[PDB]
Structure formats: C-alpha cells, structure tokens
Structure 1
C-alpha cells in the first residue's frame, strides 16, 4: 500500500475538495465523525482506502489532505461544516488577504510568506506515510491563489519530493461563472511555470460542466454546489483505482505510463456518462453500449472540443456498476465501425478497461439520479489543444495593449515573464499540431 496526499488550493480547489471527500466518505462507509464500522483493523492497516485515509487509535479515518487558501472565509466553512471532525486543524491553512485574482500576488508577494508553513504541514502528512506515491493538486487556473500559489507549491514539491508523481485537477475558466477579466493571464502564467512539474493534469472547463448541469440536470442557473457535485463524481471515477482493489491505474506512476507517452502533452480529456436528473420521476436505465457510445459525444466531455479532428495517443474506460467485459468489447466493436477514432501511427489502437462492480454513489438530496452503470473515459487526444488556442487568443488580445499588466509588474513580476509564458504555450500548441495533423 502506497499513500497519496491531496492538496486543495484556493476557493475552487477547496470547494471541489469538500465535495470529493464528502463523496469518498459515502463510497467507503465513513461517517462525518471519521468512524468506519466495516473497518475491522482498529488504529491502522494497509487496505486500498488507506491510500487516502490514515487511522487513529480511536478508529478515526482522517483524509491525507491539506487545504490552503490566502483568505479564511472558504476554509472557515470546512472548519464549522458537516465534515469538521474529519480534519485536524493543522490540515486547514488560511492567510488574512487573498491574491486579488493576480498570479503575481499569489506566486511572489503572498506565496513567499506562507510557502514554508504549507510545506511544513505537508511534511507532517508525508512523515506518517510508509511509501508516499505523491500528490493530487486541485486548483483553478483563473484565481490568484489557484494560479500563483499552486505554481510556487508545485516547484517546491519537485525540490522536496523529487521522485514523487504530481497529478493536477485544474478548473479552466468560463465567462458564465468567472470573477476576473485577467483569468487568461493567470491561466498561461501558471501553465508555463507548472508544466515541467506536473506528470498528468485533468482540465475541467467550467463551461462544459455548466452546460451539462443546464442540459442534463435541468438546472436553470447552476451554482458552484451543482458544478462541484458533478466534478466530484468525475474525480471519484478517476481516483477509484487508487482507493479500491483492482489491477489498472493502481499507482500514480501508472496514470503517466497509461495516458502520457510525451511528457509535455499530459492533459487527458475526461468524458462521463450518464448524467441523469434525480428529479426525473421516470428514467429508462442506459446499457453498456449507450453509456460507452456517449463517451464519444462532445456534449459529455469535461472540455468542449472535437476529437474527430485530432489523434488519440491513449484511451482508458473506467466503468462503475453492472458491467462485464463481453458487453464492453461488443460496445467497442460497434463504436469502431461508426465513429472517427484515429490513433497516432506510433501507438496501438486500443482501450485499457477498468471495471469496479460498486455502482456510482450519489450524495443524498443531490441533483444526480442513482444509475446501474456509469463510465469515465480518459483519452489523450490532440483535440484538447483547442482549449489552449482559445486561452492564447484572449491572452494575445489583452497583452497587445498591455491591459492590466501594471498589476503584475507592481507585485515585482517582470513583463518578460508574460512573453516567455506565451512562447511556451506557442510551442505547446505547435507540439499538439505536430502529433495531431497530417501532411
């Protein structure tokens, strides 16, 4: 057994971590007080759920988790909320003033004053691990803390834990819920500084989740609570292989081996089905063929883009519920004859398949209906570069006039860091085109 430490940075990272740990407790039969009646080994053990949970002598199961924010109001809701007893106070770290939607303020000005404290609290979790695999980092691209603090932390984690895998869950900015005009600046600056330090990053476009909540859950105007419950289902699908018995994606290293043959092209597209309204009083249950076919619909993706117009380097299907390999293999054969699935020439045309028989858990009173089977597809496709192209274009429009740049320079960042970050993204866009497009 090999531990994973989860790190939740800034508002988005913290509120998504709240939703994920709530869901993990329900999946493993852990009560809000930390007690787990089904766990017969009191005070310790090396079960699969111990990757994410440590154990006290009193039978308390404690998330291997640090929550960091530069202002207190979001983490104060964890401190006084339903799961307050789950976390020891030293896991919950807050400053007094936030990074004001400014990468430079998060990374340089406020980062420099809190970074040694955060590494000390992480070191305390690491010291209770017998075989630490590495880190799962949850943050927004758009916020000052999510962008600037995370990139400093990722750099320091490469220094202090050089052999450890780092996986990111990154919220890509959408104007329907965004709070800052400068989010494209913050997104490019953090992607540039983080890119060498991350082994595998799962981007979630708030626009895709927003539209899935409107279209499939009939929510007129989705809140963060709606978006986060859906995001937590997809995160849980991805991490289930680390928390349950199985033979696929069983360690963080296996995410890179299975999904990322080229180190810089480390952004797999997640697609999730089915998403069904709990309020829907009559629902016909979807077959293995229907949920698998829905993995090739752009409307079900975590990022809107068109995989028909790129190439695959890797594809994993992660099934939960009543699924046997025979039905998966028949589903795939039918899909191959009907869809545009083109792999690069240097990769086998193939699917790694994981099945966990426990159906998806839902949060009581939530928006998601209980279903008999669900699937998350993780595919490394060049089509995800569309999302970089969109962000780079918005960056270029503002930067050509130096709009808002004085806020970043005023924090002690050099103007040169903008053009260096942007050149790294130009080289990334070009890497995706070389792997993806024919001539």
Structure 2
C-alpha cells in the first residue's frame, strides 16, 4: 500500500517511459496482456506490483502512467505497439498539434488548450491511491512540450497537491553538442518555474551517457534505445526500497532530508556503478569496494561537470543485491582517507547508505549484464555551478544581439521575462558560490 504515480511529458518522456515500462513489467510477471501467467499458483501472495500497478477483478493490471504529448506521432506507436493491451486506453493523452521548439508556444499558446484534460485524469489515479508518496516527472529541456508545458504543470500541481514529494529527471542540453539552436532560450526560462516548484530534481546530461557507452562498454554507435535503457535502471533502483525488502529501507521521503542542504540547493547528480558489458562482466570481480571507488571517479559522472572543481556537499548511496551491511562501512574507510575527494567543512558525516536484497534483472537484448551487487550513488556537488556558466554565455550571445526573439514576442509572451529569468538564474548561481566558502 505504497503507491507512486509516474507521469511522463514529451518525446523524451514517452521514450524514456517505453524503456521504463519495459523494465517494470519484467521485474514482476506482467506480460503485455497484463495477466500474470497461470502456473496453477495456489498461494500467489505477492504484493510488489502495488506501487506501480492496480489489480482488477480479472487478471489484468493497469499502470499508473499518464503519457502526455502535443505531438501525436510518437504517442501513436505506444498505441499500436506490443503494449497496446497494457495501458488503459485513455491514459495515453495526446495533443492536437505540436509545440515545435518554442517555450512561449509550449507554455502560453498551444500548450494551454490540452492541459484542462490531463489534470482531471491525474485525479482518477490520485483517488485510487491510498498512501500516495510522490510523483515522477519525466521531461526534457529542448522542445516546447518539454520546456513550456512542464512549466505549467508545476505552477498548478503545486497548488493542487502541495505536500507530495515531486521528483524529476531532466535531459539538460549539452555544453558542446546540440540538436537545436533555440534551446538556450528554453533552458533559462524553464529554471525560474522549476526552481520553486520541484521538490527534488535529479538531472542528467546526455554526454556522459553518450561517453560511458563508447568507453566502459565495448560498443560503439548507440541510439536512444541504449541511452534510455540506462536511465531506466536508475529509476528502478531509487524506488526499489518500496518494492522489495532489505536491511535498511530508504523510502522516497528520506532522500530529500539527507541530500538537500538548503531549499534552493536541490540539484544532485546521479551515477550507476557496475555498468559493464556481458563480454566484459565475467572477467573482473564486482565486489562491494570495487563499485564505490570506481563510482567516485570523474570519468563516470553522468553530467559534464568535473567534481574535482567544487567540494562535496552531501552524498547518498543505494546498494542493491547481495550486500552485507558491514563492507559498506569499510568502503567508506577508503574514501575518506584520500585527499582527492574533499567534503565541505560544515558536514562531517556526509553519507547516507541503503541496502536492498533483490538483484537486478536484465532485459533480453540489453547492454548491461546481470550482476550480484549494484549501487546507484546520488551526490550533491558544488561543481554543478559550472554547468550553468557554460550555458549563460550561450544566452548573452543570443540576447545581446537580440536574435530569435521575434518568434517569442507575438505568442502571448513579453520581453520582460527574458531579462528577469537571466538574473533569476544569476541569483541561483551566486548562491552556490557562497556555500563552498569555508567559514572560520
């Protein structure tokens, strides 16, 4: 009785969700009819689907998902894919016409017409929940329904719900590679509405996933099947303390107590330590202490910021598999003795560990192998300050020559939100500068 609704927005939200709901169905016995297989099961006695499923009178199950898009084509494939019989036919909310890479269109003109339909449907899964914990926004930063339409959920989901712990998983635009040229306008104007309105906000750039695939594994040339399979592992490992029993149960509430110093500092990083190829997995031991010092590396941190620049603020660990609660307290002995990994002065303890029993599965055709031990390490670094200083220098080259603005003015958006949002993230960027200064 610990429900946890996941709501996905946009083309990044759908295609992460396809990899996400591949894995959730495969952990339990949900085949794409939704009926668990009949093996003349006398007992049954499994109530591990209840976080992400609801049991009907028949053998079916329905997920909690609210797939939302303004673009009808990518939501049309999940309508006629092999998961056609799984999702309830109304939960695949589509739009009527696309947003097309405009924050103004995504938030003012074409994103406002759909939203009166979805927010009824979140109630139809809210009332079914009994002890609902918090949501999971899956969204992007490039396009209109990822940047602007998600800006309009957060201004109305906060006042309608309040004390539910919302979490998100963005895809930050890279410092060097890019798909769109208009995206630094979107990525500043989306912070001002998600600084106040997202409780905890995980954030992963698509460069280190683009880098760790070509380097740790023996594979080259991946697509978004191989990126979103990796992100779909992280979302399962965070929530898995709600699904399967272990030694220390870190639910969704206790992360944000142990990871956020100040309410304006809630942007941690994320990693995944035993990512390895199945040709490569049986060569090396993957011990308890081999998956932590090979997790504090600067080469396997999923955002393009180097943590040898800033100093660590808070760290959280989520082990998974066959892990004794002893050797996680001797791996810390190797980390804290080093001089490379600096913690901030006012945080002596600086850790939060968690153990869970059930080892990860593999999807058939999946790049990462099966293991016995696995850990996801969420840390809060000061060195995330440079992932914005690389961005706003690509925003002044926009705005001081005043290019690409004539699209944004006539939609229903005035110019005053540009210079307000630039100084607003400049208020946030100064706040990281002061907490890293040592107090004597």
- TM-score w.r.t. structure 1 length? 0.93
Instruction: Classify the secondary structure of the residue corresponding to 1:313.
Output: strand
Asked if the contact 2:54–2:61 (Cα under 8 Å) also holds between the matched residues in 1, the reply is: yes
The 2-side partners of 1:109 and 1:162 are apart by 26
Asked if the contact 1:105–1:111 (Cα under 8 Å) also holds between the matched residues in 2, the reply is: yes
Q: Paired residue for 1:286?
A: 286
Deviation at 1:434, TM superposition (A): 0.8
Asked if the contact 1:279–1:367 (Cα under 8 Å) also holds between the matched residues in 2, the reply is: no
Greater CA deviation, 274-283 or 156-165? 274-283
Asked if the contact 2:249–2:356 (Cα under 8 Å) also holds between the matched residues in 1, the reply is: no
- With over 3 angstroms needed to count, the CA separation of the structure-2 counterparts of 1:325 and 1:191, relative to structure 1, is same
- With over 3 angstroms needed to count, the CA separation of the structure-2 counterparts of 1:349 and 1:250, relative to structure 1, is closer
- With over 3 angstroms needed to count, the CA separation of the structure-2 counterparts of 1:250 and 1:375, relative to structure 1, is closer
Asked if the contact 2:273–2:375 (Cα under 8 Å) also holds between the matched residues in 1, the reply is: yes
- With over 3 angstroms needed to count, the CA separation of the structure-2 counterparts of 1:49 and 1:39, relative to structure 1, is farther
Asked if the contact 2:313–2:350 (Cα under 8 Å) also holds between the matched residues in 1, the reply is: no
Deviation at 1:278, TM superposition (A): 3.1
Deviation at 1:2, TM superposition (A): 3.1
Asked if the contact 1:7–1:66 (Cα under 8 Å) also holds between the matched residues in 2, the reply is: yes
- With over 3 angstroms needed to count, the CA separation of the structure-2 counterparts of 1:398 and 1:130, relative to structure 1, is same
Give the number of equivalent residue pairs.
439
Deviation at 1:216, TM superposition (A): 1.8
- With over 3 angstroms needed to count, the CA separation of the structure-2 counterparts of 1:5 and 1:43, relative to structure 1, is farther
Asked if the contact 1:43–1:56 (Cα under 8 Å) also holds between the matched residues in 2, the reply is: no
Instruction: Classify the secondary structure of the residue corresponding to 1:40.
Output: coil
Deviation at 1:423, TM superposition (A): 1.0
Asked if the contact 1:42–1:57 (Cα under 8 Å) also holds between the matched residues in 2, the reply is: no
The 1-side partners of 2:43 and 2:7 are apart by 24
Greater CA deviation, 418-427 or 337-346? 337-346
The 2-side partners of 1:126 and 1:70 are apart by 23
The 1-side partners of 2:159 and 2:204 are apart by 27
Q: Paired residue for 1:18?
A: 18
Q: Superposed, which structure 2 residues align to 1:87-102 within 5 Å?
A: 87-102=87-102
Deviation at 1:196, TM superposition (A): 0.7
The 1-side partners of 2:288 and 2:281 are apart by 22
Q: Paired residue for 1:345?
A: 345
The 2-side partners of 1:86 and 1:55 are apart by 12
| More helix per residue | 1
Instruction: Classify the secondary structure of the residue corresponding to 2:359.
Output: coil
Asked if the contact 2:106–2:149 (Cα under 8 Å) also holds between the matched residues in 1, the reply is: yes
Asked if the contact 1:52–1:243 (Cα under 8 Å) also holds between the matched residues in 2, the reply is: no
Deviation at 1:99, TM superposition (A): 1.1
Q: Give unmatched runs, 5+ long, in structure 1.
A: none
CA-based RMSD of the aligned residues comes to 2.5
The 1-side partners of 2:312 and 2:361 are apart by 30
Deviation at 1:123, TM superposition (A): 1.2
The 2-side partners of 1:6 and 1:306 are apart by 31
The 1-side partners of 2:230 and 2:287 are apart by 21
The 2-side partners of 1:330 and 1:313 are apart by 21
Instruction: Classify the secondary structure of the residue corresponding to 2:350.
Output: strand
| More strand per residue | 1
Instruction: Classify the secondary structure of the residue corresponding to 1:389.
Output: helix
- With over 3 angstroms needed to count, the CA separation of the structure-2 counterparts of 1:41 and 1:438, relative to structure 1, is farther
Deviation at 1:244, TM superposition (A): 2.6
Q: Paired residue for 2:158?
A: 158
Instruction: Classify the secondary structure of the residue corresponding to 2:235.
Output: helix
Instruction: Classify the secondary structure of the residue corresponding to 1:158.
Output: helix
Instruction: Classify the secondary structure of the residue corresponding to 1:420.
Output: helix
Asked if the contact 1:19–1:232 (Cα under 8 Å) also holds between the matched residues in 2, the reply is: yes
Deviation at 1:285, TM superposition (A): 2.9
- With over 3 angstroms needed to count, the CA separation of the structure-2 counterparts of 1:17 and 1:82, relative to structure 1, is same
